[PDB]
Design a protein around this ligand. Structure first.
Ligand SMILES: COc1cc([C@H](C)O)c(OC)cc1-c1cc(C(C)=O)n2ccccc12
Length: 114
């Protein structure tokens, strides 16, 4: 049975995943496909890793989940040059996700749950 934090973060996760219809953030980037990746990016992150943390009930807060989401986007904006599809999408998704997960929207949602 889903815990309250699992419900909440799964909700956000699925909203965020719909901003990425080609699945460029669905699973991890690797050196095989992105030369130098693990030398440049210390803490890699992707929606699939976030999903496993939720399914495992390993998140302690919405803050932590937001910190992973931001990590994923910051990694994409660090590794990839401004000119690329991945940089530009990371930027839209980042802006979109912080709006979707604002304090007020989170407050409205937590009130209606329990
Ligand atoms: C690893 O995520 C990707 C997945 C796919 C397909 C949908 O499987 C993909 O196809 C063009 C690209 C990426 C991908 C994602 C990223 C990112 C997010 O940095 N990236 C950087 C350099 C080269 C590829 C990628």
């Amino acid at each position: 049975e889903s815990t309250p934090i699992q419900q909440l973060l799964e909700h956000f996760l699925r909203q965020l995943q719909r901003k990425d219809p080609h699945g460029f953030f669905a699973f991890p980037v690797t050196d095989a496909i992105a030369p130098g990746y693990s030398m440049i990016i210390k803490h890699p992150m992707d929606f699939g890793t976030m999903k496993d943390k939720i399914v495992a009930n390993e998140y302690k807060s919405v803050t932590e989940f937001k910190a992973d989401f931001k990590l994923m986007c910051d990694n994409a904006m660090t590794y990839n040059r401004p000119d690329t599809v991945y940089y530009k999408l990371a930027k839209k998704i980042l802006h979109a996700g912080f709006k979707m997960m604002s304090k007020e929207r989170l407050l409205a949602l937590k009130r209606s749950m329990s």
